[PDB]
Every structure is written in structure tokens, then in C-alpha cells.
Amino acid sequence: MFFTCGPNEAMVVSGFCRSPPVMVAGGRVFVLPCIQQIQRISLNTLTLNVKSE
Amino acid sequence: MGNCHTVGPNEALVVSGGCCGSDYKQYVFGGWAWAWWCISDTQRLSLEVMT
Structure with missing residues (x-):
């Protein structure tokens, strides 16, 4: 079966x-x-809001 | 009866017992493994970052 992802994501496939x-x-x-x-x-x-006090 | 187990790169799978002997640990870190219902047990541990 075919699986697709946008450029904003990476697909990792593991198995047989x-x-x-x-x-x-x-x-x-x-x-x-x-x-x-x-x-x-x-x-x-x-x-990220990197606060410091 | 045996099962096919798929493992991610983030996981250490330990299988005790199997096709190579009695007295041993089978070491896996991503990919897959074959396990016989009563000849080999399957246990996993996460390899991820903890802070």
C-alpha cells in the first residue's frame, strides 16, 4: 500500500x-x-519564548 | 505458532531463546524479529532522550 507525506514531515519505515x-x-x-x-x-x-528572570 | 514483530529504531527488543540455542539473549534495535509462542519471549525498552 502507498503512503505519502508533505515536505513538513518525514516518514520512517521499519519491518520485514x-x-x-x-x-x-x-x-x-x-x-x-x-x-x-x-x-x-x-x-x-x-x-520559543525563552524567558529569563 | 509464531509471530512476526516489527521494531522502530527508537526501541531495543530483547528476545530470549530461539533458532541459535537455549542459553542466550537475542539483541535487536529497530527492524524486526520472529518469535515462537512458547520457544521465545519478546520484551522492549525505549532508546529515546529523557530530560
Whole structure:
């Protein structure tokens, strides 16, 4: 089955015959849903209010 | 009966017992493993940052 992510995210795929996990930023990957797992990370910027007192 | 277990890079999976012997630990850190219901148990630990 095909899985897609925007450029704002990276997809990590681990599983059968994919022991070194495949990492794709903004693309499509063919995955076995019951024998391989997909995880994601947001590439967005965070505007942090860094207080000091 | 046996199960196929998929593991993320963030996890250490330890499987005790298996195709290579009796008295041993099988070491996994992402990817996958094959486990026999009564010949090999499966236990995981997170490798993430803790602050």
C-alpha cells in the first residue's frame, strides 16, 4: 500500500527485510501494512519564548 | 505458532531463546524479529532522550 507525506514531515519505515529503517522527507513509499511499520516527525519551526528572570 | 514483530529504531527488543540455542539473549534495535509462542519471549525498552 502507498503512503505519502508533505515536505513538513518525514516518514520512517521499519519491518520485514527493511531492518535499516528507511527515512523519506516529503515523498511516497510502498509498505506492507501488516508486516512493516511507519512512524513520522514534523519538520516545522517552533517559535520559543525563552524567558529569563 | 509464531509471530512476526516489527521494531522502530527508537526501541531495543530483547528476545530470549530461539533458532541459535537455549542459553542466550537475542539483541535487536529497530527492524524486526520472529518469535515462537512458547520457544521465545519478546520484551522492549525505549532508546529515546529523557530530560
